[PDB]
Amino acid sequence: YYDPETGTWY
Protein backbone atom coordinates (compact mmCIF):
# COMPACT_ATOMS: atom_id res chain seq x y z
CA TYR A 1 0.00 0.00 0.00
CA TYR A 2 1.75 3.12 -1.29
CA ASP A 3 2.15 5.91 1.26
CA PRO A 4 1.48 9.11 -0.74
CA GLU A 5 0.54 10.86 2.50
CA THR A 6 4.04 11.22 3.94
CA GLY A 7 6.35 10.28 1.09
CA THR A 8 7.54 6.69 1.41
CA TRP A 9 7.24 4.00 -1.27
CA TYR A 10 5.29 1.31 0.59
Q: Which residues contact 9 (CB under 8 A, 6 or more apart)?
A: 2, 3
Phi, psi dihedrals of residue 3, rounded to the nearest 5°: -115, 75
The amino acid sitting at 4 is: P
Method: NMR
Tell me how far apart the alpha carbons of residues 5 and 10 are, in angstroms, rounded to a whole number. Answer: 11
Which bin fits 7, alpha (ψ -120 to 50), beta or left (φ > 0)?
left
Concatenate the DSSP letters of all residues of 1-10 into one string: --BTTTTB--
Burial of 8 (0-12, 13-18, 19+ CB in 10 A): exposed
Is 2 in contact with 10 (CB distance < 8 Å)? yes
